[PDB]
Write a protein that binds this ligand. Structure first.
Ligand SMILES: *[C@@H]1O[C@H](CO)[C@@H](O[C@@H]2O[C@H](CO)[C@@H](O[C@@H]3O[C@H](CO[C@H]4O[C@H](CO[C@H]5O[C@H](CO)[C@@H](O)[C@H](O)[C@@H]5O[C@H]5O[C@H](CO)[C@@H](O)[C@H](O)[C@@H]5O)[C@@H](O)[C@H](O[C@H]5O[C@H](CO)[C@@H](O)[C@H](O)[C@@H]5O)[C@@H]4O)[C@@H](O)[C@H](O[C@H]4O[C@H](CO)[C@@H](O)[C@H](O)[C@@H]4O[C@H]4O[C@H](CO)[C@@H](O)[C@H](O)[C@@H]4O[C@H]4O[C@H](CO)[C@@H](O)[C@H](O)[C@@H]4O)[C@@H]3O)[C@H](O)[C@H]2NC(C)=O)[C@H](O)[C@H]1NC(C)=O
Ligand SMILES: *[C@@H]1O[C@H](CO)[C@@H](O[C@@H]2O[C@H](CO)[C@@H](O[C@@H]3O[C@H](CO)[C@@H](O)[C@H](O)[C@@H]3O)[C@H](O)[C@H]2NC(C)=O)[C@H](O)[C@H]1NC(C)=O
Ligand SMILES: *[C@@H]1O[C@H](CO)[C@@H](O[C@@H]2O[C@H](CO)[C@@H](O)[C@H](O)[C@H]2NC(C)=O)[C@H](O)[C@H]1NC(C)=O
Lengths: 50, 333, 99, 146
């Protein structure tokens, strides 16, 4: 079992210039469509944002 | 000196959005090709690459000048400022011009407004190969081209005397096919937009069997003639004959793999695939024939005695008959 | 000669090994449509193996009815096949290394 | 059969700023019948027009749908006939009288070998769908029988 990450952020702006925050609660700001799972091998259980 | 003034005047009061004689008459474009090569023809994707020098010549009375110089011979630099026809290849899965070291275009403008515009293209044309008679098949794959937005009453294409001409035809990257000839054609097609003049350059190709012979025909034939050895092996050598038969089966399946490995998943019986299937059926029949002989031994040895002598001549003669009918029928197409 | 299963297994399994080897070699080669030097080598080798198993077929057919001629043909095959293969290899390597 | 769609939408403009429709609504999509798929066959296609309602509003949408039915001749001839023929060869061990043990062992275990070789070559050649399929079930049936 794996935990594939998707990490993004700002290039060239440090913590003191551009701070990112999820627009809502963390786990309600990354939503996978109900038919959005194009995997043959694995089973997407659920995400976990941070 | 004078040429800069000529060019500045030519592009002064110009409008590259309007084809020459927009409202008067259709623009007549004479097209030439020079096939540098015809790359591989991969039947898996049903596409063939081709490298050409596409040249189009038309007349633009806005680009008419008077001066002692009879022709202006320019780079790609001016190509983006004058009207260029939107010719495109209707059967190209992916085409691209060349841009090294500098765009590979060419523009030439004569006194009377005749413009010649040449570029170098590599087109991955598509042609749906009808893969019957494999590997003894012959195809005719087209390179078609027409305007994209201008219908028949706005742009008309017209071939020349020596429009399409091949090069060496020996440096071509053809692997299994062989170049035999080409034809030029013109037609008018009906589209959602209108009636478009579609020009075609059919290229005729013939597959070459020098590879499939050694790969499949020879080994399958030898494996069958090898499986026949069971008949001449005595009837008491039970394990020997059984191992012979089954090992020939295993080899035949190994060969039947490589048979189809080459082709796409066409859902019909190609010729070589029919041949390999028939050879596998012959090996199957030989093994089951020995099995039935062995079974009949304990019951009727006299009946079993004549079966081997019958098979020894029925199997080779049957295979020769099948081979004759096969090779005669598939070469008469 | 009596070890008919043994010699039959040599014949057939060597044919299978040569089949696999030829398949692999021509998998390594691109898919040209004409015979290469390696292809000629493979073809002659496969013909040699086929000849070996055919010699067994004939010797077995004659054995138990004509042991004298069976043994005679077996001895000539022993003496001849290696010599023919060696001469083939010599001429092949000469002709394809002189170039 | 595979139901493959192509969805056409407006990114920013909503229904009260743009509307989509098929020009003809029966003959807007052309050339579907002339398509020649080596492995499939266009049995049917449909055109749909609707307005999908998202949180911020209703956006126009068109949908072009095809139903692809996969051809079966290639799979039959290259996967199912060989398996059945090797199964019959496996059955041949019964007609061989019991006392011949070397022959029956050789036949049975070499048929197992051939079944495995066919299965592995089918692995190699076929598309790599890493979940269980009907063809996999059939090959397991054949291997169990051998
Ligand atoms: C979605 O987004 C996509 C990405 O944003 C987008 O794709 C982009 O589309 C645009 C528009 O079609 C493309 O821009 C054009 O690109 C043409 C070149 O295309 C080939 O090369 C590029 C890379 O370009 C380099 O090479 C050319 C040739 O040398 C240079 O001209 C370029 O500037 C650039 O060179 C720089 O980089 C080099 C390193 O690569 C350096 O060595 C060099 O020094 C430079 O620094 C490839 O990316 C292309 O591949 C892709 O596209 C092809 C399409 O054919 C596909 O088939 C392929 O598979 C790839 O997908 C391709 O290989 C440029 O020629 C072109 O520039 C001319 O046109 C514009 C607009 O018309 C003019 O403004 C411009 O000035 C140029 O015109 C002048 O020069 C031409 C020369 O031919 C003259 O004929 C013309 O008359 C005119 O001269 C006049 O202006 C001159 C000023 O330069 C002046 O000097 C003259 O004197 C005169 O006044 C144009 O830039 C872009 O490449 C695509 N990008 C990608 C990644 O594909 C896509 O469309 C979007 N989709 C939608 C639906 O919107
Ligand atoms: C392939 O899949 C798509 C979507 O999964 C199928 O589209 C569906 O088609 C049916 C029949 O046209 C639609 O039913 C319609 O419902 C509306 C109610 O708004 C009604 O007005 C129509 O008369 C019809 O009953 C269904 O809505 C539609 N689904 C979606 C999500 O668009 C399609 O039929 C499948 N088959 C093919 C060959 O494409
Ligand atoms: C190439 O196309 C041309 C025009 O469609 C064919 O016909 C020749 O065209 C030239 C230029 O107009 C005439 O001078 C000849 O008299 C035409 N010959 C005919 C009609 O037989 C030409 O035959 C085509 N050539 C090939 C190889 O396809």
């Amino acid at each position: 079992a794996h935990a594939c990450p998707l990490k993004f952020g700002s290039y060239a702006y440090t913590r003191a210039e551009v701070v990112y925050e999820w627009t809502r609660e963390p786990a309600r700001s990354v939503v996978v469509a109900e038919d959005g799972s194009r995997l043959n091998q694995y089973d997407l259980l659920g995400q976990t944002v941070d | 000196g004078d040429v800069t003034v000529i060019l500045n005047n030519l592009l002064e009061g110009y409008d590259n959005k309007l084809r020459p004689d927009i409202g008067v008459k259709p623009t007549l474009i004479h097209t030439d090709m020079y096939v540098n090569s015809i790359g591989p023809v991969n039947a898996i994707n049903m596409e063939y690459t081709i490298d050409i020098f596409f040249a189009q010549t038309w007349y633009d009375r806005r680009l008419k000048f008077n001066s002692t110089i009879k022709v202006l011979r320019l780079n790609s630099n001016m190509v983006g400022k004058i009207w260029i026809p939107d010719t495109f290849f209707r059967n190209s899965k992916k085409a691209d011009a060349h841009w090294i070291t500098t765009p590979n275009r060419m523009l030439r403008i004569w006194n009377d407004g005749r413009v010649l515009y040449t570029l170098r293209l590599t087109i991955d044309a598509e042609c749906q190969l009808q893969l019957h008679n494999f590997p003894m098949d012959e195809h005719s794959c087209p390179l078609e081209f027409s305007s994209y937005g201008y219908p028949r009453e706005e742009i008309v294409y017209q071939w020349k005397r020596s429009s399409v001409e091949v090069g060496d035809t020996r440096s071509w990257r053809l692997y299994q096919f062989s170049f035999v000839g080409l034809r030029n054609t013109t037609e008018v097609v009906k589209t959602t937009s209108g009636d478009y003049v579609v020009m075609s350059v059919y290229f005729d190709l013939s597959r070459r069997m020098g590879y499939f012979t050694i790969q499949t025909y020879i080994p399958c034939t030898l494996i069958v003639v090898l499986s026949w050895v069971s008949f001449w092996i005595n009837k008491d050598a039970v394990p020997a004959r059984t191992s012979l038969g089954i090992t020939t089966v295993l080899t035949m399946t190994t060969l039947s793999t490589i048979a189809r490995k080459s082709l796409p998943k066409v859902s019909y019986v190609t010729a070589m695939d029919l041949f390999v299937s028939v050879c596998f059926i012959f090996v199957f029949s030989a093994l089951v024939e020995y099995g039935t002989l062995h079974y009949f031994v304990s019951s009727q040895p006299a009946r079993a005695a004549k079966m081997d002598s019958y098979a020894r001549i029925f199997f080779p003669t049957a295979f020769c008959l099948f081979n004759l009918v096969y090779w005669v029928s598939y070469l008469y197409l | 000669r009596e070890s008919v299963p043994a010699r039959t297994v040599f014949g057939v399994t060597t044919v299978l090994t040569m089949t696999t080897l030829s398949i692999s070699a021509r998998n390594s080669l691109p898919k040209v449509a004409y015979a290469t030097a390696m292809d000629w080598f493979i073809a002659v080798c496969y013909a040699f193996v086929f000849s070996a198993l055919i010699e067994f077929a004939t010797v077995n057919y004659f054995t138990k009815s004509q042991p004298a001629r069976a043994a005679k043909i077996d001895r000539l095959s022993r003496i001849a096949f290696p010599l023919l293969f060696g001469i083939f290899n010599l001429v092949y390597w000469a002709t394809y290394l002189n170039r | 059969e595979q139901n493959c769609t192509l969805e056409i939408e407006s990114y920013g403009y909503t229904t009260d700023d743009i509307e989509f429709y098929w020009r003809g609504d029966d003959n807007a999509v052309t050339g579907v019948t002339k398509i020649e798929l080596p492995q499939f066959s266009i049995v049917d296609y449909k055109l749909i027009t609707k307005k999908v309602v998202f949180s911020t509003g209703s956006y126009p949408r068109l949908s072009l749908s095809f139903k692809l039915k996969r051809n079966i001749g290639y799979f039959i001839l290259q996967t199912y006939m060989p398996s059945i023929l090797i199964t019959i060869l496996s059955w041949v061990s019964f007609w061989i009288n019991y006392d011949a043990s070397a022959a029956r062992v050789a036949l049975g275990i070499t048929t197992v070998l051939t079944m495995t070789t066919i299965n592995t070559h089918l692995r190699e050649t076929l598309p790599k769908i890493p979940y269980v399929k009907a063809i996999d079930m059939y090959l397991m049936g054949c291997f169990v029988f051998v």
